[PDB]
Design an enzyme around this catalytic site. Structure first.
Site, short mmCIF file in Angstrom:
data_model
loop_
_atom_site.label_atom_id
_atom_site.label_comp_id
_atom_site.label_asym_id
_atom_site.label_seq_id
_atom_site.Cartn_x
_atom_site.Cartn_y
_atom_site.Cartn_z
N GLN B 11 51.22 34.15 45.45
CA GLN B 11 51.54 32.80 45.90
C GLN B 11 51.24 31.79 44.80
OE1 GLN B 11 49.64 31.62 49.59
NE2 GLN B 11 50.81 29.69 49.78
N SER B 140 48.71 37.30 40.47
CA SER B 140 47.46 36.81 41.01
C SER B 140 46.76 37.96 41.69
CB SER B 140 47.72 35.69 42.02
OG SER B 140 46.58 35.39 42.80
N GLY B 144 49.01 38.91 47.48
CA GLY B 144 48.54 40.26 47.21
C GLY B 144 49.46 41.10 46.36
N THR B 179 39.22 33.14 47.73
CA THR B 179 40.33 33.06 48.67
C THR B 179 40.18 34.02 49.84
OG1 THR B 179 41.84 32.46 46.87
CG2 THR B 179 42.82 33.23 48.93
N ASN B 206 39.92 28.84 38.59
CA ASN B 206 40.41 27.58 39.12
C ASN B 206 39.34 26.53 39.06
OD1 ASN B 206 42.71 29.09 40.03
ND2 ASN B 206 41.27 29.91 41.52
N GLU B 254 51.78 39.29 16.48
CA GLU B 254 50.82 38.98 15.47
C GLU B 254 49.46 38.86 16.11
OE1 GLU B 254 51.95 35.55 13.35
OE2 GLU B 254 50.61 35.87 11.64
MG LIG Z 1 53.04 37.83 48.40
#
Ligand SMILES: [Mg+2]
EC number: 3.6.5.-
Lengths: 429, 441, 429
Positions: B11, B140, B144, B179, B206, B254
């Protein structure tokens, strides 16, 4: 002038040509009324080889209407561009074939052929150097095939020099719109293997697949479909209609397409085919459309090149490009999947280009290659014919027409002979 | 010639992507539909947009990036959003039922469901591309699929091409902010299947985005708009060399085995600056030295792992705008000067300058003020192992209690994946443990 | 005609030669377009030994472009005087070395050498009595050295009679623009000690020091720097380009500069170097510029004559003066600081003069002397190489190229051998 004519029967095909001439009108930009409203003489240059000027500039088709019941005649008679027609050709029937092909071939077959072949013949005198004519029906019944069989026989005799490029609808393996299909079909195809000069396969399910998957459309009808096919059948004469740095006509095509005359059942590919958003995913290149060209999903016929082998393959290009690309993709592809290219046909891919694409698009592609994958097609339909012919299921509707069964054997071991014939050519090196 | 392509998952992840392509499209100023405001003159010397924005036969210039995630609601907002002329349908692949943050689901269960479509799209783009250097992949450990399905994604994509670079942007479980609680499972199950399928990648947390936007951007109340904007800037500059003239237009490949000298511990930090307000844009001057000395503020460290607790290894301070080799150079002497900082001495200096001449562009409606010079401190130290250790200890106990395990065992993973993956962080703990050891004598 | 060629790779060096040919164009006053707009035939007399006339008088360079990614090719391709080029030579890469020197030496090294050495060879046929050619890269990576190593090997074999005067950038002791520098460097320098004919050291920090202190400039870039160096590298052929009451070529130079072939790493001094106000402090004399000549601050290399000892020293003078002065200052100086003059090399200072100075100035000075102070240079870089090679830091980027470490030992005890070699020559009498 290599001008040609059209003749349509067929429960659908009568609609098909309606869409077809409709499309050609667009590519000639002449009003429905029958006068030109376009912007280049080029539409007028070679206009005649499909159209016909009239006193006052009524511009008219060289079409021939087949039907056994006027409804279609009213239908297209109710058609936009309907004022672009000649009332003469509205040659229909008072009965309908009921799609017992013997009905449409002996019963009503012999009943109404005469007025057709006469007026058609009057069109034959109307043609200066007739390259040919375009017939259209379906290969499962009689609404087209009933009489169209007689057409191919009669004109074929009457014009043993003219090209007979025949498109008729093939029953898809899954959906049986009628169960008398194997019988009409087999009886016809016996004839068509003998008498027709060109044929290309007309499935519905492919057209569905195109509209739903690759067109990404949910609502299928005929009319869109005939748009999709009259796109191609409209493309075919482009060079013959318009200049091309690499031109090839139906004679150059078929003679450059067929090794032996029994192989004029051809499969078809036309493109591009997107929904609206697609252009904002992708753009147009010759290599791109090439990358569609050998797509089984554009393989609009019941035969699989993925299963069969390209006996032949060809490309019909309309647009403005560099052939230096074109060929390059050609040969590239003829290598890339060499295995589905039949062997002893060196350069079994062949080329073309029309200086103008069809209207609305910048580049055109068409593929009428010929593998031998159709063997499953004939094998299927022959199989169902076999089963119920074991049963004689609906023989009574049939023999009520007063045919023999031995004819059924004739198209039977006939059509099997053609299949195995394709087997040996496929199985050889 | 020099292509890269972006992949978007989870998300927050595709949130990032949306911010990004908003950004670049802003920065080359090609209008959202797909056209530039004006015609493009024919020239040579270097590429342009052509890297990512896709040339048509007309004013249609779509990104070279791909969306993939099994939670398809939000992506539709792109499917609806202003850039619905921008993007392209086949650019869009989503799953309906996402992972429920089962790693094992969109990795295993729904892992099986959309892979082939993904790979076909990849073949369409890379076949469309020529000198695609590497792969921009975003996901992320939260949304999930961002863990699971991405895990298969690189797991196979690497085995497809290999020779491309892996440009890894994914988010890491914030140290105390979070989360969920299965995050241990998501992360570590990702990690043992992440590493050997990863080339190199950075860890964005974050809480730093919050604290720093609120102090340095003077932000009162932020969200993923601000975050996604910020990562938008950082990626905006991490690839300018392939987009804009700079003195030392260094490249990803590089960067690869030079920033991350060994093969193993190949991640890093990234504290971009100068992020300030319009009222600090004025009332300030924003020296090269200010961005530079400021670049190493541990409190400026854009991922919540104390640099001062670690020992630096490399620092690719690629710079936007009016940069002087000398001035920065002496600042780098100043960085050698910093007593508190300590370096993998067997790599005494490993520095690698980046001086791209375009100073930064700002996104209207944004909070960052306009400047003349940008820094990206992609740097690698010893410090970052610790928060990992928190991850494996937290996960250690929770897994010891078999918490949630029914969820995953229900979807087709085995227990030795768990304990063994803990051996994985064991080994990497040996790696940050060992490479930080000073070579004897 | 003792004409020569240029070949440049190098993250900077590709820019360097751009500035260089730029400068030479100024000294030949030919338009960017490629035709002469100057005022003496003398610019045209010996023009060929760098340039090449073309049909229509396109006057062109004998340059060779090295690169592993076209950006520089576009860059200078975007260059003023860019219309003074030949599109042929724009030989670049599609990848970039990433400066792992094995990448630029095996991987991409072997990948693109061929097209270069071919076209270069076509230049070799274009050269009547080729005195040589000028290579340029940096000695810390692969953007130049990656392939330039292969160049020196290949052409060196291909032309065992030609001069190879090699300038490549040396990493300053303080600022490490990359940490893989010791490894690229050492691996290269193994080669260069064997294969290159002349070398002069290219630090950045010296150039900064010049621009900031003695130039009194605050804003350093490359381009000015390449102005400062292509000043000298441009001076070097002056006599070879123009008359001189006391002339000496690169053969006379090196043969008159080197005792033993392992000593063709030379340091450089060019002058005058002022900011604008300085002339209104001071004026120009041969003794003056002499008083700059032995300035460590003009000693543009990481080696200190103040710490090392002049194994050799020389002066390149362009202008119009009295050599009666010149020599007099020469010998005077060879006494004045005799201790930094190595002993058994009597008259270890050597002379030259070009009848014309460079444009804009009336008198020219150049110093490419050779002490042995560089020992700290190799000692440093070898030291860092030693440390991380204890660690094998970024060996994985390295061995991923599929070299061995034993090569690293080879350039290692190699380069140490060269250092101690300079120790004994310095420590002897
Ligand atoms: Mg998803």
């Amino acid at each position: 002038m290599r001008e040609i004519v059209h003749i349509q029967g067929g429960q659908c095909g009568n609609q098909i040509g309606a869409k077809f001439w409709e499309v050609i009108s667009d590519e000639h930009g002449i009003d429905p009324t029958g006068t030109y409203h376009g912007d280049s003489d080029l539409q007028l240059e070679r206009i005649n080889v499909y159209y016909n000027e009239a006193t006052g500039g009524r511009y008219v088709p060289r079409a021939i209407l087949m039907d056994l019941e006027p409804g279609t005649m009213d239908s297209v008679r109710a058609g936009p561009f309907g004022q672009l027609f000649r009332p003469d050709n509205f040659v229909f029937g008072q009965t309908g074939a009921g799609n017992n092909w013997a009905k449409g071939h002996y019963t009503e077959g012999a009943e109404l052929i005469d007025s057709v072949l006469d007026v058609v013949r009057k069109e034959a005198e109307g043609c200066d150097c007739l390259q040919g004519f375009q017939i259209t029906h379906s290969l499962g019944g009689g609404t087209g095939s009933g009489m169209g069989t007689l057409l191919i026989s009669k004109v074929r005799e009457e014009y043993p020099d003219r090209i007979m490029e025949t498109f008729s609808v093939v029953p898809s393996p899954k959906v049986s719109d009628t169960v008398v299909e194997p019988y009409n079909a087999t009886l016809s195809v016996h004839q068509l293997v003998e008498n027709a000069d060109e044929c290309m396969v007309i499935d519905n399910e492919a057209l569905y697949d195109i509209c739903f998957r690759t067109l990404k459309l949910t609502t299928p009808t005929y009319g869109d479909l005939n748009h999709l096919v009259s796109a191609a059948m409209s493309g075919v004469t482009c060079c013959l209609r318009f200049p091309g740095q690499l031109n090839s006509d139906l004679r150059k095509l078929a003679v450059n397409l067929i090794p032996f005359p029994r192989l004029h059942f051809f499969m078809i590919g036309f493109a591009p085919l997107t929904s609206r958003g697609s252009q904002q995913y992708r753009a147009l290149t010759v290599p791109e459309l090439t990358q569609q060209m050998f797509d089984a999903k554009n393989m609009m016929c019941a035969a699989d090149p993925r299963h069969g082998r390209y006996l032949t393959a060809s490309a019909l290009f309309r647009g403005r490009m560099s052939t230096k690309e074109v060929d390059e993709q050609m040969l590239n592809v003829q290598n890339k999947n060499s295995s589905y290219f039949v062997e002893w046909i060196p350069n079994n891919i062949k080329s073309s280009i029309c200086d103008i694409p069809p209207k609305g698009l910048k580049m055109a592609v068409t593929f009428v290659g010929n593998s031998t994958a159709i063997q499953e097609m004939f094998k299927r339909v022959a199989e169902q014919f076999t089963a119920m012919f074991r049963r004689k299921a609906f023989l009574h509707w049939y023999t009520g027409e007063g045919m023999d069964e031995m004819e059924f054997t004739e198209a039977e071991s006939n059509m099997n002979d053609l299949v195995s014939e394709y087997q040996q050519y496929q199985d050889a090196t | 010639m020099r292509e890269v392509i972006s992949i978007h998952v989870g998300q927050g992840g595709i949130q990032v992507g949306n911010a990004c392509w908003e950004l670049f499209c802003l920065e080359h100023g090609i209008q959202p539909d797909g056209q530039m405001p004006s015609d493009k003159t024919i020239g040579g010397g270097d590429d342009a947009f052509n890297t990512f924005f896709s040339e048509t036969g007309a004013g249609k210039h779509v990104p070279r990036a791909v969306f993939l995630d099994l939670e398809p609601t939000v992506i539709d907002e792109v499917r609806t959003g202003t850039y619905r002329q921008l993007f392209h349908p086949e650019q869009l692949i989503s799953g309906k039922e996402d992972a429920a943050n089962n790693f094992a689901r969109g990795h295993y269960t729904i892992g099986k469901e959309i892979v082939d479509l993904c790979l076909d799209r990849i073949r369409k783009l890379a076949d469309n591309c020529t000198g695609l250097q590497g792969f921009l992949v975003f996901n992320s450990v939260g949304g999930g699929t961002g863990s699971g399905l991405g895990s298969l994604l690189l797991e196979r994509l690497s085995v497809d091409y290999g020779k491309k670079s892996k440009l890894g942007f994914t988010i890491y479980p914030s140290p105390q902010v979070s989360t969920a609680v299965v995050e241990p499972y998501n992360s570590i199950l990702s990690t043992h299947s992440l590493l050997e399928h990863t080339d190199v990648a950075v860890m964005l947390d974050n809480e730093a985005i919050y604290d720093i936007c609120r102090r340095n951007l003077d932000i009162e109340r932020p969200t993923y708009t601000n975050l996604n904007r910020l990562i938008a800037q950082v990626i905006s500059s991490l690839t300018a060399s392939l987009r804009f003239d700079g003195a030392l237009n260094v490249d990803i490949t590089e960067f690869q085995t030079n920033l991350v000298p060994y093969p193993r511990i190949h991640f890093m930090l990234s504290s971009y600056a100068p992020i300030i307000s319009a009222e600090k844009a004025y009332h300030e001057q924003l020296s090269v030295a200010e961005i530079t000395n400021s670049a190493f503020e541990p409190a400026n460290m854009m991922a919540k792992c104390d640099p001062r607790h670690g020992k630096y290894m490399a620092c690719s301070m690629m710079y936007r705008g009016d940069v002087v080799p000398k001035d920065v150079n002496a600042s780098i002497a100043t960085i050698k000067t910093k007593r508190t900082i300590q370096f993998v001495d067997w790599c005494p200096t490993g520095f690698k300058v980046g001086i791209n001449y375009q100073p930064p562009t700002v996104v209207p409606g944004g909070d960052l003020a306009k400047v003349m010079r940008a820094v990206c401190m992609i740097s690698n130290s010893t410090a970052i192992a610790e928060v990992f250790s928190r991850l494996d200890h937290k996960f250690d106990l929770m897994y010891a209690k078999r918490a949630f395990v029914h969820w995953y065992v229900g979807e087709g993973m085995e227990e030795g994946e768990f304990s063994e993956a803990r051996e994985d962080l064991a080994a990497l703990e040996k790696d940050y443990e060992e490479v930080g050891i000073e070579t004897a004598e």
